[PDB]
User: What shape does this take?
Amino acid sequence: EYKDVETDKKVKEQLGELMEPALGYVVKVPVSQSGVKRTEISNPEAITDEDLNKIPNYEIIKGVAYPNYGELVDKTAAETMKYVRSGYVIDVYHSGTRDKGYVFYKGITPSKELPQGPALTYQGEWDFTSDANLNNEEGRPTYLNDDYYTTAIGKRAGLVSGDAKPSKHKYTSQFKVDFATKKMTGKLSDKEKTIYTVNADIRGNRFTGSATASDKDKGKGASYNFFSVDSQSLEGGFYGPKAEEMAGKFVADDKSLFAVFSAKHNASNVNTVRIIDASKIDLTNFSISELTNFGDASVLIIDGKKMELAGSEFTNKHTIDIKKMVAVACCSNLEYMKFGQLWQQTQVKDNSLFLQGERTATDKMPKDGNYKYIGTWDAQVSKENNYWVATADDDRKAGYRTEFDVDFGSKNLSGKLFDKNGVNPVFTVNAKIDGNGFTGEAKTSDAGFVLDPGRHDNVKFSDVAVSGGFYGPTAAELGGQFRYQSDNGSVGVGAVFGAKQQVKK
Assistant: This one.
């Protein structure tokens, strides 16, 4: 009597290769090898590491500096920042053709909640490395000892901001983010001079846009301008639970400069709306853990390495080697959310459930209406050493079904979760809708849930935290999860679910 609501398919945007989101990025500072006149900025390497205090490739540059009697010096903005890092690690006694160091930025905890209210100002600093260029036609200066600690400026080795003298150069960053219009602007400055102005749009917890040179004239000699080229590849993201901080990068279009930045805001009472759901219920510890997501539910990221969840059937197994990592995703009729199981093959190690979703815009939420939602779910109930397991399918008749009664009018949500060939639901969900997400309670039947008959030992409870959310442009997709344990843990339950909006007949 019900069928799925016809919705617009996920508008796909084939991003440029230098726009792919990541926890961080690191660029080796170019050094012209013997005979080479100019060395472009190489492609930025992505940071998968999740340790903030860990400077990327520090052990490589150290392995070059030490046997060459060089001393390292690093600026990472650690004292000021909490969730982000940016700056450089360079060899200060650099000479010849060996490595000079790396310019980088990284962050932990990509934001899942974004500030809601007044436009915020993020203040911080920015660093850079330039093209290496020997060519006299270019006219890169030497002997500016009032300005830079290095006698040559970006000739054989690229000019790093750490070569600049504090008495003449302080590189500061300022950004004014308007989360409402999803727009961002800012200035990269040196002392009082504006060097770059930036424009960026917000997508998920990342931002993409451009950098603009304030001084287009390149000049020559001691009047040489390392910052005369624009950039059409400014990418970065927000970090911290509520977008407390931000960090990013951009490459000059001619690859003559690579810049990074990081900045934090100073707002004291920030109201936030949630934008991303990406959790990981464990099936041994029944703990809920946070997964690294950048605003795309169809991509599950484990240890920095990405895994696309899109398949051909209703549920699709995917395998990624990083030790063998396996995941069964769902569902094909869902586009702004995914869920399923996730384990490590070696016999299953770290059996887990996961759910990811792109929250509906908090203002796009239907304020009135009564709708039906039909879906499915994956779960694992366990008392002692015997188990019961639910597995997502497309059998709307007698499979592992989920039904939902959503009333946007009264902000009420009731749910039914079924076992295969189950007449009456195993779990019942009653929730209250708040914004774009819902919270409520999950109870077994008022008799208990019996795993399997012999002898009888059942799992029975009420009042279990049911956190959920609506996903997509028109909230036509919902999903949530719940979990609990006693005798931590003789009894344990983990479950994740999803459902699509229905139209009658």
Summary: The CA atoms of residues 20 and 176 lie 23 Å apart. The longest strand covers residues 370-383.
